[PDB]
Structure formats: C-alpha cells, structure tokens
Design a protein around this ligand. Sequence first.
Ligand code: BEF
Ligand SMILES: [Mg+2]
Lengths: 122, 130
Amino acid sequence: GKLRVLVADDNTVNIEVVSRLLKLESIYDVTIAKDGQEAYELVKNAMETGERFDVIFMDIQMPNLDGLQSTRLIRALGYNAPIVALTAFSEESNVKECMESGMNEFLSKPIRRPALKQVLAK
Amino acid sequence: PDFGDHVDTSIFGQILEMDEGDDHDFSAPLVLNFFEQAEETFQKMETALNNKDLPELSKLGHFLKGSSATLGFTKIRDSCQLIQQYGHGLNVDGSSEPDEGVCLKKIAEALASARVDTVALHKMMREFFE
Ligand code: BEF
Ligand SMILES: [Mg+2]
C-alpha cells in the first residue's frame, strides 16, 4: 500500500522536484541519498533491517561513488527491485552502460509527472 | 514576468504548476535554492580552473546542467553543457581538443556567460516572486 522509495542525487534542486512529484503521487516514505556511497549504505541497511525499498531513483553522476557503480554494488548485494536512472542526457546510448550496470528504467531531466507515473505503473 | 531568452516558459510553467497555490510556496524556495547552488558551483569551478582539473569541471558543468534544465533556465543550461564537454576535452563538433589551454580558456568563457546570465535572471526572478 505504502511505497518506500530511495532517491539518490547530489543536486538538492532535482531532489526537491522529484520529492514533490512523488508527494503528488501519494508517496511520502522517501529516503534521500546525496551520493552513491550513501545509496549503497542505505540499501544495505534496508536489507539488514528487513525494510525493502520498493523502487530506487539513481542519478548517474555523483561524488564518492557514481550511480553506475552504486547500482552494480546494489545488485551485488542481491537487491532485485527496480532501479530508475535520473539522467541529464548528453548522449543516447548512455543507457546501454546504465543497463549493463543494473538499471531498469530511464528518466531524463527535466522530470515531470507524466513520465514518472508511467515508470511507477509498471 | 518578461524573462526573454533566459527562460523556457513551458518548462518553468510546469514548475509553477507544482505549487499548491498562487503564493509560489514550492517555486520560490526552489529558485532561491538554485541561486545559492549556482554561486557555490561557480566558485568550485574557479578553483578547478585554478587547479586546471578538467575532469572536476566536467562534473561541475553536468551538476548544474540538471538543476538549470529543470527550472527551464536555458542560457545557463547551455553554458553548463559546454563546460561539461570542454571538461571531457570535447569540442562542440565532438572532436577532442589536445590543447588543455584552449579547454581551460573556453570553460572560463562559458562560465563568464553563466555568471552574467545568472545575475540577469536573479533580478527577473526576485521581482516576479517578490
Ligand atoms: F548528476 Be546526474 F547524472 F544528473
Ligand atoms: Mg549528479
């Protein structure tokens, strides 16, 4: 009934926009990661405490550990739920390395309610 | 207000639709945060130019591209796209620039555009939001 969502981005502007769009979609249990190392730690903790994140939103470029590497580590942990890339496309096949890293779906900034909803439906 | 070529109204309008009211409850803090972020980012870019760290500059360019893109600040976004590419040692046409100096220089030129367009947009916004 209630979704538990993780949003990982280093940019607070994008965080607040995504958080609003999620709140509009009646999703309140939203945890924030500022980089990919935090994201890994939060998923690890979530599996350790038995609280599964139902979806993760993962920015590609972040300090300490980027989104591609964080995702690979997350899959390595055995987290098997969807991961959605938050991207600022400078290329088209950037998705291939993303999918190779373990990401499932793709949102390009600017992120809006129509596209987020389509992702959540599936 | 009249923003000009500084704002894509369609994209920025979608941000205003995320307000619960006409009081700009969401929009005004968000755009205020962006300007704090923009100034800090510009300062980190200057350090990186000083340290001549093209990779760091590429990440900083991309960082601010996403926030400027979400708010519809096209001029800042495009300058940020240029800083991202030149930081990868890439020209506009996609060729590699072996000359680090040229990359450094052109990043500075794009950063100058961004600082000017940021000041211009800061006024337009400070008015409109009041
Ligand atoms: F920093 Be992310 F790839 F927008
Ligand atoms: Mg980022």
